[PDB]
A paper describes a structure:
Hepatitis B core antigen (HBc) is one of the best established VLPs, and has been confirmed to be a safe platform that has seen use in both animal models and at least two clinical trials. Heterologous antigens can be inserted into the major immunodominant region (MIR), which is located at the tip of surface α-helical spikes, or the C-terminus, whilst retaining the ability to assemble into a stable particle. NadA is a member of the widespread bacterial autotransporter family and adopts a trimeric structure, dominated by an extensive region of coiled coil, with a small α/β domain at the tip of the structure which is distal from the outer membrane surface. FHbp is a lipoprotein that binds serum factor H, as an immune evasion mechanism, through a protein surface which mimics carbohydrate ligands.
The simultaneous incorporation of NadA and the C-terminal domain of FHbp into HBcS generated a modified viral protein which is 3.7 times larger than the native scaffold. Consequently, HBcS-NadA-CFHbp was subjected to higher resolution structure determination by cryoelectron microscopy. Processing of single particle data showed that the T = 4 form of the capsid predominated. Examination of the cryoelectron map shows a clearly resolved HBV icosahedral core shell structure, with additional density clouds present on the 3-fold and pseudo 3-fold axes representing the inserted antigen. The density at the strict 3-fold axes is weaker than the pseudo 3-fold positions: this indicates that the NadA domains may retain their trimeric state, and that the flexibility conferred by the flexible linkers is better accommodated at the pseudo 3-fold positions of the HBV core shell scaffold (the linkers do not constrain the NadA trimer axis to be precisely aligned to the capsid 3-fold axes). Only minor changes in comparison with the native crystal structure were seen: the largest change was a reorientation of helix-4a by 4.5˚. Interestingly, the spike conformation appears stabilized by the base stacking of Trp71 and Tyr88, which could play a role in stabilising the NadA insertion. Electron density for the CFHbp domain appears to be absent. This may be due to steric clashes which could de-stabilize the folded state of the antigen domain: limited space on the interior of the capsid would constrain packing of adjacent CFHbp domain monomers.
Residue numbers in the entry:
A (entry chain A), D (entry chain C), E (entry chain A): 1 to 76, 385 to 445
B (entry chain B), C (entry chain D), F (entry chain B): 1 to 76, 385 to 446
Write the structure that this text describes.
Amino acid sequence: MDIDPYKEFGATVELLSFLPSDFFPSVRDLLDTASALYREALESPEHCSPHHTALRQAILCWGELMTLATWVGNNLRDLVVNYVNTNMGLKIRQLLWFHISCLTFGRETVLEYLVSFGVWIRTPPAYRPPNAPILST
Amino acid sequence: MDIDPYKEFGATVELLSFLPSDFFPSVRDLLDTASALYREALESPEHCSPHHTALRQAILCWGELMTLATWVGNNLRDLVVNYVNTNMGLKIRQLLWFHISCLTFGRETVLEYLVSFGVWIRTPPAYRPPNAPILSTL
Amino acid sequence: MDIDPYKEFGATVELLSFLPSDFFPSVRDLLDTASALYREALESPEHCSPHHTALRQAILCWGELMTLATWVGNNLRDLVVNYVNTNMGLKIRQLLWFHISCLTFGRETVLEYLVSFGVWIRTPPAYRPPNAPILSTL
Amino acid sequence: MDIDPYKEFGATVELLSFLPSDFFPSVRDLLDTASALYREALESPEHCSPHHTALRQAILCWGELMTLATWVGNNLRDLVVNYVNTNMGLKIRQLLWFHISCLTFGRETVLEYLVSFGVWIRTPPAYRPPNAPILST
Amino acid sequence: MDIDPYKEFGATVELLSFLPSDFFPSVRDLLDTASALYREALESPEHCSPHHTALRQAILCWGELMTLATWVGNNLRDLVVNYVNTNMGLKIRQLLWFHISCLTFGRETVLEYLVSFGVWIRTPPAYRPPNAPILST
Amino acid sequence: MDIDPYKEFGATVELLSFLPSDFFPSVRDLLDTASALYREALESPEHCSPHHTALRQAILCWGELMTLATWVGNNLRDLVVNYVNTNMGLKIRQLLWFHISCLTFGRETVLEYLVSFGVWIRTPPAYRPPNAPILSTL
C-alpha cells in the first residue's frame, strides 16, 4: 500500500517536491529546534495535535537509523555514512521540517508557504527575486 | 531527549516490555493485517484517531528500514538482515501490534490486557497457569 | 518492638507466608512494574493511598541496600550480593509484590487471593488442579 | 524513578540537609523515642496518619541495614559499621527525626521550625537570638 | 540549583542559543541604548515591569565585572581582558539585549523574533534570504 | 549612569551601608538559604514578586563572578580570590540578604529594621545597648 505521510495534513509528497533537496537543514538542526521549543510538549502525554504524534514517531525513527548506521560502521563501510545521512536522511529531514514548521507557524501557513515557494522556485533566475521566501509569525 | 512513543496512549515502554519476542507475529504479518482491514482508513486524509496518525508513521519507518537492508545487501552483508529483522524490528513489531490492537479492541481492552499479561509472565512457570491470557473482545 | 508492615492493610506476615518463596518475581520485575503505570503517582506529592506511601519507602530502602551492596563489592565479595538478593531482598520482594498488586487489583481482591492461593498450595500435588489462581481483570 | 520521601509531607531531602548534620540525635535515641510513646500506634493495625505508615517502614528498613552490617561483621568487616553510620545512618536519622517530630508537634510546626532553625545557625552569632530555637507544642 | 534567567520571561537559554555569539552588539552599545531610552525609568523607583528590575541588576553586574577586570589588569594579564569581554561578557550581552528589546518591542514580539530568527539561521545559505530578520515597532 | 539596586524596594544603598561586614553570613550560606526554601519559587516561571525577579539575578551574577575567580586561579593568582570574596562579595551579600529577608519577613519588617539598626550602630559603644537589634517576625 502507498501510505502518503502528508495526506492527512493537507499536503502531499508531490507538494514537498517543490522544495529542493538542499533546502532542508540537517537533522541535528531540526532536533535542536524541536528540543528548544517543544521538549516539554513532546514528552507530555496530552494530545494537543496529531503534529506532535507524527513528530514523536519521526524522532524515534531517526534514532533507529543512526543506531543501525552505527552498527554497520562498527561491524561491516564509510560509504554507508554517506548513504544514510543523504539519501535516507532526506525523508527524515522532510518529516522533521514539516511538523516543526506546522507546530510553530500553523498548518495553514505552511501549506501556503509551499505554494509561495513554488512560484519562487519555478521562476527563471533572471527574474527571480534574490531572497527566497522564508517563514515567519 | 527521551520520547516514549506510547505515553500518549496510556502505556509505557516498560509496560510493553513484559511481552516476549514471540508474542508478536512477523513484521509482514502485521503490515498485511494493517493493509487488509484499515487501508481505507489509513490512505484516507481523515484524522479518525491519534492511532491512525501514529500507525502510518510505523509503515513508513519500516519501509525506510528495509530500504537500507536492501541497500546494504547489494552494495557490500546478510548478517545485517539478521540484525534488523530480529533485534531492531521488534521495536517496530511492538509499535505495529499496539496500535492495531488498540484500533481493533479499544485502548481499554489492550491496557487491561498488558497488565493481565504482566502479572502472568512475571509469575514463575511452576506457579503460572499454563494458558497464556489471550486478547479477546469481551 | 516488632512491626508487622502488612498489619495495617488487613494482612499479616502469616498470610504472606502461604506463598512459596520463589513465587515472588525478581526486584527488577517489580520496580519496572511500578515504573510502568505508577511512576506518576509515586513521584506525585498527592497522598493517594497508604499503599503509595509504603511503596515509596520500600523502593528507597531497596536502593539503599544496593548502594551498600555495591560498596562492599567496591571496597572489600559478590557473596554479599548473593546474601542480599536472596535473603534480605526476599523480604523486599514481599512488599513490592504486595503494594503493587493492592493498588492494581484492589486490596480486598489481593487478600482473597492470598487465601485462595494457600488452598492451592496446601492441596497435595496429585490432586492439585493444573491452573493456579492468578490475578487478572475479566 | 526518583522518589523524594518527604515530598508528600511538604518537605524535600534538600530542606532537611539544610540543618547541620550533627543536630540530629542518634538513631538509638529515635528508636527509643518511637518505642516510648508511639509503640502502641505502630503496632496498631489502624494508621491514624500517613506518618505512621511512613515511620513503620523506617524501623523495618533500619532493621535490614543493621542486619546486613552485622552479617558482614560475622564473616569478613568494621569499615562497614562506620560506613553505615556515616551515610546510610544519617538518611534514616533524618527520616526518624522527621516523622516523630511531625506526630508530636504537627507538620506545620515542624516545617516552620526547619526554616527557622537553619536560618538561625546561618546567622552570624552577634545578630541573632542567643539560644537555638526548639520545637513547641 | 539551575536558575534559568529567562524562564519567567517566557524564554529560555536554549531559545537564545538560536542566536549566534557574534549577533549581539557590544556592552557599550547596549548601555547607550539603555541610557538613551530608559535613563529616567531605570533610576525611577516605580515598578512598571520586571524587565526593568532584571535590567538594573544586570547593569550593575557588568559594573562589577569591569571593576574586577580592572583590578586584575593593574595587579596581576592582557589575556584577562580578552577572556572577560568575550566569554563572560557574552552572558551579559544576552541579558542586556533581551530586556532592552523586551521593554522597547514587547515581550511577545521578542519571543516571536527568536523563532523567526531560528528559521533564518537553520536555513541553508543557498536558500537563505540575504538580510537577517530584524526587530522593528 | 548610577543605578541604586534597592531604590525599587523603598531602600537605598546608604541605608544598607550602616550594616557592618560581619552582619551578613558567608556567600554560600545565603545561597544555601535561597536554595533550601525558595527553590520551587525561583525555578518556577511565575512572577510571584519583584524580589524573586531581583533575587534570581544575584545568583547568576555570583556564579558569573566565581567563574572568573576559578578562571584566574588555574590560568595565572590566589590573591584575586581574597579580593572577590571579601571586598566585592559584600555587595552580593548585601543584595542576597536583603531580598531573602524581605521575602521571609516582608519589606516593612526589614525597612523598619534597617532604621532601628541605623540608630543603633551610629551611637557610640559607651552609650549603645550591648545587644544588637535582631531581626524578628514580630
